Structure formats: C-alpha cells, structure tokens
Specification:
The complex is a heterotrimer of chains A (108), B (116) and C (129).
Chain A: E1 4-7, E2 10-13, E3 19-25, E4 33-38, E5 45-49, E6 53-54, E7 62-67, E8 70-75, E9 85-90, E10 102-106
Chain B: E1 3-7, E2 11-12, E3 18-25, E4 33-39, E5 46-51, E6 57-59, E7 67-72, E8 77-82, E9 91-98, E10 103-106, E11 110-114
Parallel strand pairs in B: 2-11
Antiparallel strand pairs in B: 1-3, 3-8, 4-5, 4-9, 5-6, 7-8, 9-10, 9-11
Chain C: H1 5-14, H2 25-35, E1 43-45, E2 51-53, E3 58-59, H3 89-98, H4 109-114
Classes of the chains: A mainly beta (108), B mainly beta (116), C mainly alpha (129).
PDB class: complex (humanized antibody/hydrolase)
Keywords: humanized antibody, FV, anti-lysozyme, complex (humanized antibody-hydrolase)
Assembly: trimeric
Chain lengths: 108, 116, 129
C-alpha cells in the first residue's frame, strides 16, 4: 500500500504569487501521479496527470514536476479563481490513495 | 456526452447495508472502469475502490471485507454495496470514470448519512 | 525477433510512445503483445488482399506498401518490408501516424479487444524505467 503524504494542509497568498503544493509518495509511484482541484460544493476536477501532463482547458498557471517519490504542483500566479482545495492521487498499481489535499486561499 | 449520476438513500440506520447506484452514459461500460470515492462532510477524499472495464474489482485494504461492486450493462449502471454501516460511513459517495490512469469524469455526488 | 515487454517498453519509451496522445506506455506494450506477440517478423493475412506487418501489424492496404495489395493508399508512405525489421523505429513512426486524434488507438484490433479497460500498466510494471 503506497501512502500519499501531502503538504501543506493549507496556505495563503496574494493574487500574483506562485504557490507550490507537494505530494511525497511512501513508495515509488513512477510518475503515475494526478492532481485534482475542488471548489466548495462540487466534485473534484482533473488538472494534471502522469505528473506533468495537463487536462484540456486547464490554464497554464498550473504545472507539475516530479519523479520517484517526490512530486510537486505549481500555480504560477495565484488568481481568485484558484481558491479551492487540491489533492493528489497516485495510480501506481492498486489500491490508490489520495493526499489529504491542501486548501489554497487568498491572503487578507 | 460523458455523464455520471449517483443515486441512493440519504438516511440509513446503522448495521443496515448501504447500496448506492451510478448510472452512466456517453461511453463504453467495457472500455472504461469506474472508481468509487467518498468524502465525509468537511473531511478529505477517500478512495473506496474500482471495477475495471473487464469486470474486475479492487478494494481499499480497509473497507474490503464489506464493499461489493457491480456492473450492469443493462441499465448502464454500476452498484456499490457497503455492508453494515457504522456512523463514519456518513459521506458523499462519488463515482468517477477512470480513463487510462486518471479520473476524468466525476459524478455530482450524493450524500448519505447514518442516523442514531 | 521476439523482444521482452521490458525490453520493448524501453524502446517504445525511447521512441516517444510514453504518454503519446495521452496514451500510457502500458497500452503500447499490450498492443504489440497481442498483435505481434513481440515478434518483428510477424506477418498475418486477412480476408482481402491485406497482410499486416511487424510488431504493430501495420496494414498493407492503408499504411505501408507491399506491391501486391489492391487499392494500396500507403498513408504512412513506407514499404511493409521496412516494418519486419529488428528496429522498431520504422513501425513506431507509422504507428504514430495512425493515432491521430487522441483516440486513435482503437485502430489496433487486439488492443481494443484485450487491452482497453484492463490494467494495461501491468505490462510495464517491473521494468526499470
């Protein structure tokens, strides 16, 4: 069972800032990591798969790099429409596990 | 035209068996698999398990001895039976479509809570 | 010759097949597995003038040429003879030509029959990559 350890639990920043969330995998997941975004009230939505590859329509502000157990997701310019909680989920064999998700928010 | 919609009870007496339904459309029940994930009100996203396009199942090593997953190519629906629910099975059950290692289509989610 | 999943998965990896058109490397291995059964010398006949060639069984009617098949459109612009090589380069290219949209993979019969909706990853699991 590969566990997912995601941090931080929540962060705050001003629009225009780069924020970075990370997922450290209990074992090598081999780039099979995915990132979802969730706004209060609705299901999670796909943002990135296979570590760097973004979903359709997703803005470029988002990115993701990582290998082995260390994976990271970057919002290059925190914008008002980015305020949600972000999770990670590995797809390296089963079962899969989600990180606990970070809650991004606007400073002040 | 990819749509998923979960349906089930909101209220369920403990010790009883939870059984929600996920009805899809817009895609092949045999070329895509489906994952069930739940989320307690306020808490994070828990992965309950999946059923592969080829009829195969895989459950999270905790809820395993109590979740049963079924497919029904008839009404285009997948079923999840959660047996003898305590009161931490209170959550919003999702059903997402799994496309080549990524949950790209997600249901709207239905809340289910156990009373007492 | 008959490669190895890890052996081939490696080459397909080196040849741009990993996550091409959002298609996990598992898929590319599962295909060759069933189509050619890891053999570059594979050649299979059809129910027409067609003869599939190589590890990815590329069709003599629409993709490569073998000057013996009626209506040869040769869309990959390549002789089927170059597809029975011990170098999966030739094939991989042409293969990249079929998959056009992002659902192009359905083209392979075997992939669509015994690969879609399965744990295709399992094919690459255990390979050092």
């Amino acid at each position: 069972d590969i566990q997912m350890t995601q941090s931080p639990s929540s962060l705050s920043a001003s629009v225009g800032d780069r924020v970075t969330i990370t997922c450290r995998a209990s074992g090598n997941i081999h780039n099979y990591l995915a990132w979802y975004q969730q706004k209060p009230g609705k299901a999670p939505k796909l943002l990135i798969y296979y570590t760097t590859t973004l979903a359709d329509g997703v803005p470029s502000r988002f990115s993701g790099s990582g290998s082995g157990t260390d994976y990271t997701f970057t919002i290059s310019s925190l914008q008002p429409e980015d305020i949600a909680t972000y999770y990670c989920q590995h797809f390296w064999s089963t079962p899969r596990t989600f990180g606990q998700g970070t809650k991004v928010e606007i400073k002040r | 035209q990819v749509q998923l919609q979960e349906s089930g009870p909101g209220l369920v007496r403990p010790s009883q068996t939870l059984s929600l339904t996920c009805t899809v459309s817009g895609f092949s029940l045999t070329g895509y698999g489906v994952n069930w994930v739940r989320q307690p009100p306020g808490r994070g996203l828990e992965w309950i398990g999946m059923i592969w396009g080829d009829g195969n199942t895989d459950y999270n090593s905790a809820l395993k001895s109590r979740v049963t997953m079924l497919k029904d190519t008839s009404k285009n629906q997948f079923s999840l039976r959660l047996s003898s629910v305590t009161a931490a099975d209170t959550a919003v059950y999702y059903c997402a479509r799994e496309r080549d290692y990524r949950l790209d289509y997600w249901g709207q989610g239905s809340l289910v809570t156990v009373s007492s | 010759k008959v490669f190895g999943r890890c052996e081939l998965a490696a080459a397909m990896k080196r040849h741009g097949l990993d996550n091409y058109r959002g298609y996990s490397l598992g898929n590319w291995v599962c295909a060759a597995k069933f189509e050619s059964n890891f053999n570059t010398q594979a050649t299979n006949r059809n129910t027409d003038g067609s003869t599939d060639y190589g590890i990815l069984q590329i069709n003599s009617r629409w993709w490569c040429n073998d000057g013996r098949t009626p209506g040869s459109r040769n869309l990959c612009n390549i002789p089927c003879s170059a597809l029975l090589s011990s170098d999966i380069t030739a094939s991989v290219n042409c293969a990249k030509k079929i998959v056009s949209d992002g659902n192009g993979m359905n083209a392979w019969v075997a992939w669509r029959n015994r690969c879609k909706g399965t744990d295709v990853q399992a094919w690459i699991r255990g390979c050092r990559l």
